[PDB]
Structure formats: structure tokens, C-alpha cells
Design a protein around this ligand. Structure first.
Ligand SMILES: CCCCCCCCCCCCCCCCCCCC(=O)O[C@H](COC(=O)CCCCCCCCCCCCCC)COP(=O)(O)OCCN
Ligand SMILES: *[C@@H]1O[C@H](CO)[C@@H](O)[C@H](O)[C@H]1NC(C)=O
Ligand SMILES: *[C@@H]1O[C@H](CO)[C@@H](O)[C@H](O)[C@H]1NC(C)=O
Ligand SMILES: *[C@H]1O[C@H](CO)[C@@H](O)[C@H](O)[C@H]1NC(C)=O
Ligand SMILES: [Ca+2]
Ligand SMILES: [Ca+2]
Ligand SMILES: [Ca+2]
Ligand SMILES: [Ca+2]
Ligand SMILES: [Ca+2]
Ligand SMILES: [Mg+2]
Ligand SMILES: [Mg+2]
Lengths: 172, 33
């Protein structure tokens, strides 16, 4: 049946320079990982040892790079367009492998202050607004996300490649 | 021109508009007028 890895990240920004993160991931309905801490010291844990020490440390390294880049982008939208703080952002993302064997379905949705904001469309690796309220913030955030390899193709690859291999290896 | 997270670097006429092509908003972020 539908094998899947889901990841959840909630980021509470007191101001542009300080964030508290809280997240987790699950394989099907089983909780597998938790993430929590200030930007300066975010703890990332696999609740069971699904990955051996070296391979886990490589995952942890990529996640910590991601968190600094995510914080960077939020700081950049503030510096360029002004955001109102405090604000909370929720990213919910994952990969889902159909039993029939068609291509994995992936997603990466961002909400701000509990409302839909933008989400990723993996067919052409582009982000779109989920809200119909137009604003300089949404326009600029989409311009940035759709401008770079990192936030388009590397992001797609994490979902369709890294996430899918992890599902195939660790459930089975 | 912009590359991923380059815009957190201070603006630079040389880096941005002479070594690369800059758009009007990148130029204005240098002029600070
Ligand atoms: C899949 C197996 C992995 C192992 C299992 C994971 C263990 C989970 C443990 C923790 C719980 C999960 C919570 C965190 C979610 C992590 C998501 C990480 C994705 C990631 O690293 O993306 C990299 C791109 O990042 C970027 O592009 C950086 C910025 C991305 C922007 C995101 C959108 C935010 C919008 C904010 C804008 C401003 C808002 C204005 C109010 C590309 O992945 P890769 O580096 O692995 O490379 C792959 C290609 N080779
Ligand atoms: C999973 O993460 C989100 C953090 O935003 C949270 O709301 C949900 O409570 C978390 N689950 C657990 C079991 O901590
Ligand atoms: C998010 O909500 C907070 C707390 O209610 C508010 O002060 C802030 O202006 C909001 N920020 C947004 C919508 O970007
Ligand atoms: C995307 O990033 C830069 C474009 O500025 C380039 O060095 C790189 O080759 C591009 N990616 C691919 C796979 O071509
Ligand atoms: Ca540049
Ligand atoms: Ca620039
Ligand atoms: Ca600039
Ligand atoms: Ca350059
Ligand atoms: Ca700029
Ligand atoms: Mg500007
Ligand atoms: Mg030069």
C-alpha cells in the first residue's frame, strides 16, 4: 500500500534574527524523528536507529544547512519587503509512493501564521501562491524561490530522490 | 544579478552591476537614495 515519509517543521520567529524550531517526521503512521531547539542549537534525533552513525551524521548535516538557509531566506524577505514579527511559519512536506508503481507524489506546503501561503509544484519545479491575497511579500518570496537551482531542482530532488530512497530502504 | 542568498551580502556596485548585470532594484539598493 501507500508508503510515505512526511516531515513537519514549525518555525517561531520572535524577530528576524531568532527562531525556535519544532518538527518531526513519520514513516506511515509511525513517528521516526524529532527536531527542536533555537536556531543556535537545534537538536535533531532519530527515535530508532534507522540510519548507521555515519549516514545519520550526513543527514543531520544537510538538515542543519537547510535550517540556516531557510532562516536566511526569511531574513532576506524581511530586509527587502518588511515582515511583521512575531510570525510562525509551518512547512509540511513529504513523498508518497503509490503501490501500483507510478511516480512518487511529493509536496512541500508553506503556511504563515496558520494560513496557506505558497507551495511547491514538482512537475516543473516551481512555487505558486496558495493565498489569493496579493502582496509585495508573496510576490518577492515566489520570485526568490523560483529563481535558483537550490530552491527548485535541488528541492525537487530531495523530495523525489532522497525522500523516496529513504522510504524504500527503511520501511522496505 | 542574484544567486541564492547573495542578497544577504551588502550591496556592491562592482560585484553586482559591473561584474554582473544588475536590475533597477539592485542598482537602487546600491544608491540608497
Ligand atoms: C528524505 C530523507 C531525509 C531523512 C529523513 C529526514 C529526517 C527528518 C528529521 C527532522 C524532522 C523534519 C523537519 C525538517 C524538514 C527538512 C526539509 C529539508 C529539505 C532540504 O534540505 O532541501 C534542500 C534544498 O533546501 C533549500 O532550498 C533551502 C531553503 C528552502 C526554502 C523552503 C521554503 C520556505 C519559505 C520561507 C520563505 C519566507 C517566508 C516569508 C514569511 C535540498 O535538499 P538536499 O540539500 O538534501 O539536496 C538534494 C539534491 N541533491
Ligand atoms: C510534530 O510536529 C509539530 C511541530 O509543529 C507538532 O505540532 C506535532 O505536535 C508534533 N508531534 C509530536 C508527537 O511532537
Ligand atoms: C503573525 O501574527 C502575529 C501574532 O498574532 C502578529 O503580530 C504578526 O503581525 C503576524 N505576522 C504576519 C501575518 O506576517
Ligand atoms: C544551476 O546553478 C548555476 C546557475 O547559476 C550553474 O552553475 C549550474 O550548472 C546550474 N545547474 C545545473 C544542473 O546546470
Ligand atoms: Ca550577484
Ligand atoms: Ca544582487
Ligand atoms: Ca543587492
Ligand atoms: Ca558574481
Ligand atoms: Ca535585492
Ligand atoms: Mg530591494
Ligand atoms: Mg571586480
Amino acid at each position: 500500500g501507500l508508503q510515505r515519509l512526511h516531515m513537519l517543521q514549525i518555525s517561531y520567529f520572535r524577530d528576524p534574527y531568532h527562531v525556535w524550531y519544532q518538527g518531526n517526521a513519520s514513516l506511515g503512521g509511525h513517528l521516526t524523528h524529532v527536531l527542536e531547539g533555537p536556531d543556535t542549537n537545534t537538536t535533531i534525533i532519530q527515535l530508532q536507529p534507522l540510519q548507521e552513525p555515519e549516514s545519520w551524521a550526513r543527514t543531520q548535516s544537510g538538515l542543519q544547512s537547510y535550517l540556516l538557509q531557510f532562516h536566511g531566506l526569511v531574513r532576506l524577505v524581511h530586509q527587502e519587503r518588511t515582515l511583521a514579527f512575531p510570525l510562525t511559519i509551518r512547512c509540511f512536506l513529504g513523498c508518497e509512493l503509490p503501490p501500483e508503481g507510478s511516480r512518487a507524489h511529493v509536496f512541500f506546503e508553506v503556511a504563515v501564521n496558520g494560513s496557506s501561503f505558497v507551495s511547491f509544484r514538482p512537475e516543473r519545479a516551481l512555487w505558486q501562491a496558495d493565498t489569493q491575497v496579493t502582496s509585495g511579500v508573496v510576490t518577492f518570496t515566489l520570485q526568490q524561490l523560483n529563481a535558483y537551482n537550490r530552491t527548485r531542482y535541488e528541492l525537487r530532488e530531495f523530495l523525489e530522490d532522497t525522500c523516496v530512497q529513504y522510504v524504500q530502504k527503511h520501511i522496505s | 544579478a542574484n544567486s541564492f542568498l547573495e542578497e544577504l551580502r551588502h550591496s556592491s556596485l562592482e560585484r553586482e552591476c559591473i561584474e554582473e548585470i544588475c536590475d533597477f532594484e539592485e542598482a537602487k539598493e546600491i544608491f540608497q537614495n
